[PDB]
Amino acid sequence: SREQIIKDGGNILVTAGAGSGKTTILVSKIEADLKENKTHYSIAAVTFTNKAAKEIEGRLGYSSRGNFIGTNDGFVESEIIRPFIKDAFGNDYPDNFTAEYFDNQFASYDKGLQVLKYQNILGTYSNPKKNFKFQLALDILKKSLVARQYIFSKYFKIFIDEYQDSDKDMHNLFMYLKDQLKIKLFIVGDPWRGAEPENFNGLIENSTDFNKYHLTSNFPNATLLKEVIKYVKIYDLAAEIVGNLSSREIKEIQKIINELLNQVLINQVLINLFAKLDTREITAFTEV
Amino acid sequence: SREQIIKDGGNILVTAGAGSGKTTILVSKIEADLKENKTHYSIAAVTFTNKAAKEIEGRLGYSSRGNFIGTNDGFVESEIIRPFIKDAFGNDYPDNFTAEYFDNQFASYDKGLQVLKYQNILGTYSNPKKNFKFQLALDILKKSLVARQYIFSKYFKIFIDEYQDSDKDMHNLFMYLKDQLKIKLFIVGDPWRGAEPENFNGLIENSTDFNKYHLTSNFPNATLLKEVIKYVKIYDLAAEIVGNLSSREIKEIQKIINELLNQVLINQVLINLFAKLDTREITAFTEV
């Protein structure tokens, strides 16, 4: 149910099914906490989908509290990486770089860290098992005292959804926030490229202090094929894909999409789009 | 004489020797033109040395006219590249780029452009004779209408001292600003590594619309070792270098300079200092 989780103020684990109630329970809990808390502290809402952040933000409405509603990748950049990169790693490192997921991939953290200073763009990890950005954000927090002070003094609770898609390294940063930075966590999981269901599924059994709640249902890549199909009938398409797409990257993507709008050329376009980031899905695209 | 220069409103050649009179006559002419002109137009004072910019800028004082006093590369980036890069070359190209002379050098213009789109950070040309940044600025002006409109409607006269030390690429842009965009020019030449004095000397007699005014004396790398010697006894001597210097590059300069403060170590740090950027000079350094 919804009443008892509203009363609870500690760490809350929600096991909503099919995502029907995830966004609804997120908005309700956020409003309840914001109206109850009269202090200067604010909340941060992080979503894998950029569109999911936008629809959530629209439901809270205008507010000057300073709350953060955005993507998981956009949270670390805006709140941890951008302001405190120079303090943690000296003035040489830049704070005006740009994150590009498709280009400039590296193989090792040390190589990824060493290219970062000279490249002046936020690089990405070629391997899908690890996320370099969240390792860098975690490293910044440990190194920088002011970064630790700011995070504690800014946020009192963090709202996370789609936690079963969270990477193991991404899980590592959040548990850093919860354990010594003493920040309440409201994470939602359901039974992303480097998705690690292991960390979320094992979290329920490993930790007993966390509170778990399972709401009733009523009260994998086919999504993006439907989105390009409806677009054929581009910025909205960007919100569906996880992360924040660069202008250069989306212009290249849009060039491929307008090339789509015969069956043979349809299949080749879907192949390269998948390469940039199933035999049944291509047939469905051919049908529509 | 000085009063002959002041009342002239056209294009002025100044041939002052040793730089004693050219520095004070540049400030005097700038003040005279600013006082005389009551319109919204401003002037741009560009110098090879960053130090020369501040010493000139300190002689005008605080003003809301919107005048520009700075380096040649600083003028091109702040007034042409940064605002109008996206308009000329599409939204894919960035404007949060940074200038780094020591790394990411380009061998070809088209390759230099194509690496710029993906690396997203400005750099210098590998060949010192060519300055990739300035033809990029010239290319931006030719392609962007708003960039051409802004420059014409902002500045009515440009002050470029040490024009005999100007490069061919820099000369190409300034002449485009003069004859094509109809902007008054005020240059100084007294007969940067990759430049040539031939262009200025040739332009003395090649151009008939230009005015040749002679300024008498009384009215190569010796400095760089003197600046570090007084530093031994970091942002100051870095400012004396030609062009804007990145913070990381300054830090690298700092870590290679502090090693100097035996004789053999002195010679080797001088050698790679030149490599990053004479037998008599190293001996003089050993003496001091």
Swiss-Prot record, chains A, B:
Alphabetized UniProt keyword annotations: Antiviral defense, ATP-binding, Helicase, Host-virus interaction, Hydrolase, Nucleotide-binding
One example GO MF annotation: ATP binding
Domain of life: Bacteria
Domain UvrD-like helicase ATP-binding: start-end pairs: 1-219
A single GO BP: defense response to virus
Deleted gene: phenotype: When this gene is missing the Gabija type I system does not confer resistance to SpBeta in B.subtilis. When this gene is missing the Gabija type I system does not confer resistance to T7 in E.coli.
Binding site for ATP: 16-23
Residues marked Interaction with GajA (site): 146, 149
Subunit-structure text: Homodimer. Interacts with GajA; 2 GajB dimers dock at opposite sides of the GajA complex to form a 4:4 GajA-GajB assembly (GajAB). GajAB interacts with Bacillus phage Phi3T Gad1 protein; this interaction forms a 4:4:8 GajAB-Gad1 complex and leads to GajAB inhibition.
Protein family: Belongs to the helicase family.
Function: Component of antiviral defense system Gabija type I, composed of GajA and GajB. Expression of Gabija type I in B.subtilis (strain BEST7003) confers resistance to phages phi105, phi29, rho14, SpBeta and SBSphiC. Expression of Gabija type I in E.coli B (strain ATCC 11303) confers resistance to phage T7. May be a helicase or contribute to GajA activation.
Entry text on domains: Contains a UvrD-like helicase domain.
Name of this chain's protein: Gabija protein GajB
Naturally occurring in which organism (per UniProt): Bacillus cereus (strain VD045)
